[PDB]
């Protein structure tokens, strides 16, 4: 019973930290993708 309960708890902890990890990757992904988009726009006017 205790084995089952502790596996549940560690899985719960992993699940709890995973969301915030995803959010952080999302945040820094937006940060870089901004500069990606503007650099694309520079290359666009160069094509023009």
């Amino acid at each position: 019973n205790a084995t089952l309960f502790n596996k549940l708890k560690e899985l719960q902890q992993a699940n709890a930290e995973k969301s915030k990890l995803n959010d952080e990757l999302r945040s820094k992904y937006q940060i870089e993708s901004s500069k990606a988009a503007e650099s694309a726009q520079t290359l666009k006017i160069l094509q023009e």
Binding site: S19, D23, R26, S33, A36, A37
Partner: protein
């Protein structure tokens, strides 16, 4: 075999010169839009 057997032992004259085929459809290809940057927008799973 056949006696119909068209006998004309001479060089012929060009009648219809070879031209570029007058088709308006399919010497081209199919257009395709793709970009990993439209997989950009993500949700924030917040409830649970």
């Amino acid at each position: 075999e056949n006696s119909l057997s068209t006998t004309s032992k001479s060089k012929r004259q060009v009648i219809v010169p070879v031209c570029m085929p007058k088709i308006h459809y399919s010497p081209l290809k199919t257009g395709l839009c793709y970009d990993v940057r439209m997989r950009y927008h993500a949700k924030i799973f917040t409830s649970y």
